Nucleic acid binder design. Structure first.
Lengths: 131, 136, 94, 38, 176, 66
RNA sequence: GUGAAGAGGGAAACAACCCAGACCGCCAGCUAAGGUCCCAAAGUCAUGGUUAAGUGGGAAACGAUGUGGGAAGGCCCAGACAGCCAGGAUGUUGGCUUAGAAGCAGCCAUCAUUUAAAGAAAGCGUAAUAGCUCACUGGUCGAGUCGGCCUGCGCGGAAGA
RNA sequence: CGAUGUCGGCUCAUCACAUCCUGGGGCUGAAGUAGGUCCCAAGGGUAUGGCUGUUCGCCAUUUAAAGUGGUACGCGAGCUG
């Protein structure tokens, strides 16, 4: 960081999304390249853009403190880095579809697209949604 | 070399060098080199340190030289016996008391000044110390 | 914020000043107004780190001297010539 | 190697050690940066 | 200090007894016996090796971390065993094993003969290689270093008995 | 710095030697007052190439064959 | 001031250095400088710190993760220092001399995207490349850690018959 | 200064290490040979002559090299003059 208040700024940046959280999308890609992360972001770049917040400050004392205001379900997974791909209009969106693209391209790891906040399921497929 | 133009007396005493310095204050520049030691400065040494400092800044900043030698210590032609008067004047030296600011410089950053003053530090015959210009 | 818990001096002079300056505490004196000049003792170590803050000069000091608290201003700074330490600072009673 | 009276950190990998009472400068990158006492 | 504040739990079965101030590890790859400096107080107690910073001996804390890594690598050696692999780099070089002695040729006139210490066993998967197995990390490290010391790799092409993991620098002539 | 007319001729290229003199002046001249200089100067060291070439070319006394 | 014209004790030996002014005798006692492990008279004295070099018990400019004590500061369980597990990119040959000189000969300048981050660039190696990358950026373990300042004592510096 | 005989050579040495050679190594603008510099090492070894009164030196020819100095710039109650 540059300041602890900047670390607190990263904390409040996370709560702006948690106040608008509708679902939960996880990606535990520990081994990735800049263009690897960019190939996923161009898919996000032409669907929405930067709107799909990818604020990765997933420490047990960082992300866990920035979630309990609303949708406390992701606090149980908390740490062990999660590349969050969530947007404001994410309620039943094409976010689950963006991870199957990564499992076939360059990434053998993407947390196997689990989904925790209200998909009414787990690791298994999510295709039947008003998307 | 720094020599007094039209001196009144050609040769003076070797005297003594004691007491704490006079020029403790730094006002012209912002960063200056101070002499924590006590010794003597030859003419060639001050001209060597002027050239070894004008190299690093490459025509930036403003360099000041606080002291002027103004005292000709002498040497005699070797193999001569003692007596017959004092020798011929060879070079000019300034006596330095502890706490005397030698150089002053501004128009340079704080980081570059600390490094360039190390160049002249090894060119002078006594102990060095780096300080900065403070109000009061 | 510039408050210094200070003590007064029982002795003074050339050697007496060096006697306590070696005990890591330098002398100072406050003059001004119409009252009596007060030779005050104060620890050395704290001030060198306090004068590092540039606002130390321009702002009004608020040190205390045995009960009565007097607001002061710094007048003179007598630094030791070659060694990086202080010896004597003058206080304008302001 | 080069003996001196001043062991200095020349490269970015030149490590400093006080091996056997003698201060030396070992270097895992440049082999001509080996220095001895000083 | 840091590593001294990290206990060493031995995988059960590989017995360890404390006979005074000498640590005896009985396992699958033999028996290891090594002394200790009088500044560290040891204790097995459960299966966790704890080292103590005794008073008086002012180098005691530094002695702790030292003894820690030693015994850590010691107990690991009796279980699996340490391995080193050196490539016989060089055109026209020969290296072979004949019993407990090593008969190799570094391009010298006379064949260099090296002797295996105690339990160090040698074998060659190929003519241009050697692989050494053993118990201690010191004896496995000494022979690997001594064979490297018979002929170090060149700075021009790299001919010599070197470590397969160690990369050598590559120089080149001044103008030719 | 043993300065000539054109080249400054730097010190280090001269090995000053002291040899016992040759004179009819007793104890001073025969042993102690060595004071005689056989200056060791060679051409190979930093003389401006033509000075080197115009030193070996025109043979002269006081210079060696080498 | 001493010696000269003052011996005596100490500085191993040493007119002038430190102590001290021999009238004589004594197998008597108290101190001075300086000393109290043995030679050699008296402390293997007490207490509390300090050095690892036989420093002490010959000496400097300068060099240094030696080490003791003291103060402030930077960062630090909204988890750092160091490793490890990943990246280090988006235009680019950087425009210019584009004669071959691709962030990697060199003038000089240097913005903005993907963002937790990445200098139109820290280095080796390259006619020119690649690779590995150092910066700077995420998870793992998760306790303090980092850089200077003032001083105490030491190391190297330190080669003669 | 009521004496401490003077260079060089000869004979005979002996010590220091700031090493000329042999020995052991680091590094290179070290491919190989051959060289450069630095570090450890004083055990041993360490030219014949022409010219000069010489030391010194130049030259001729050698050698692994033909080291540098201390010793009243060793050595005249040992020689030479």
């Amino acid at each position: 960081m540059a300041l602890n208040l900047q670390d607190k700024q990263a904390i409040v940046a996370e709560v702006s999304e948690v106040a608008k959280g509708a679902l939960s999308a996880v990606v535990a890609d520990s081994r990735g390249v800049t263009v690897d992360k960019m190939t996923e972001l161009r898919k996000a770049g032409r669907e929405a853009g930067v709107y799909m917040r990818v604020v990765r400050n997933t420490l047990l004392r960082r992300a866990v403190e920035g979630t309990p205001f609303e949708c406390l379900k992701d606090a149980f997974v908390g740490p062990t880095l999660i590349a969050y791909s969530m947007e404001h209009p994410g309620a039943a969106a094409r976010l689950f579809k963006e991870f199957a693209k990564a499992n076939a391209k360059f990434e053998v790891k993407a947390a196997a697209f689990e989904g925790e906040l209200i998909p009414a399921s787990q690791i298994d497929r999510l295709a039947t949604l008003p998307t | 070399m720094l020599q007094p133009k039209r001196t009144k007396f050609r040769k003076m005493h070797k005297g003594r060098n004691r007491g704490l310095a006079q020029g403790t204050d730094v006002s012209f520049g912002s960063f200056g080199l101070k002499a924590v030691g006590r010794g003597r400065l030859t003419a060639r040494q001050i001209e060597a340190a002027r050239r070894a400092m004008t190299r690093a800044v490459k025509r930036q900043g403003k360099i000041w030289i606080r002291v002027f030698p103004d005292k000709p210590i002498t040497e005699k032609p070797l193999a001569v016996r003692m007596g017959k008067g004092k020798g011929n004047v060879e070079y000019w030296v300034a006596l330095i008391q502890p706490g005397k600011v030698l150089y002053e410089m501004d128009g340079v950053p704080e980081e570059l000044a600390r490094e360039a003053f190390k160049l002249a530090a090894a060119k002078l015959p006594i102990k060095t110390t780096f300080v900065t210009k403070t109000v009061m | 914020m510039f408050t210094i818990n200070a003590e007064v001096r029982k002795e003074q002079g050339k050697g007496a000043s060096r006697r306590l300056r070696a005990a890591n505490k330098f002398p100072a004196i406050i003059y001004g107004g119409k009252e009596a000049p007060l030779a005050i003792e104060l620890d050395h170590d704290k001030v060198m780190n306090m004068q590092a803050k540039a606002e130390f000069y321009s702002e009004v000091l608020t040190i205390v001297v045995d009960g009565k608290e007097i607001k002061v201003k710094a007048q003179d700074v007598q630094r030791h010539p070659y060694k990086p330490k202080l010896q004597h600072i003058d206080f304008v009673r302001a | 190697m080069k003996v001196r009276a001043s062991v200095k950190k020349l490269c970015r990998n030149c490590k400093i050690v006080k091996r056997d009472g003698v201060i030396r400068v070992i270097c895992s990158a440049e082999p001509k940066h080996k220095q001895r006492q000083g | 200090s840091r590593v001294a504040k990290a206990p060493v739990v031995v995988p059960a079965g590989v017995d360890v007894k404390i006979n005074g101030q000498v640590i005896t590890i009985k396992g699958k790859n033999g028996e290891l016996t090594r002394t200790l400096n009088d500044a560290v107080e040891v204790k097995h107690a459960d299966n966790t090796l704890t080292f103590g910073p005794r008073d008086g001996y002012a180098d005691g804390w530094a002695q702790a971390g030292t003894a820690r890594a030693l015994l850590n690598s010691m107990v690991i050696g009796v279980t699996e065993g340490f391995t080193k692999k050196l490539q016989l780099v060089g055109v026209g070089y020969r290296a072979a094993v004949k019993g407990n002695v090593i008969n190799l040729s570094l391009g010298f006139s006379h064949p260099v003969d090296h002797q295996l210490p105690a339990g160090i066993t040698a074998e060659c998967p190929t003519q241009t290689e050697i692989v050494l197995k053993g118990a201690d990390k010191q004896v496995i490290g000494q022979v690997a270093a001594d064979l490297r010391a018979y002929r170090r790799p060149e700075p021009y092409k790299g001919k010599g008995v070197r470590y397969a993991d160690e990369v050598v620098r590559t120089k080149e002539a001044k103008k030719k | 710095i043993v300065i000539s007319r054109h080249v400054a001729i730097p010190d280090g290229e001269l090995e000053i030697t002291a040899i016992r003199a040759q004179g009819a002046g007793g104890q001073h001249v025969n042993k102690t007052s060595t004071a005689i200089h056989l200056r060791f100067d060679i051409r190979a060291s930093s003389l401006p190439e033509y000075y080197k070439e115009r030193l070996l070319a025109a043979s002269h006394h006081l210079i060696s064959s080498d």
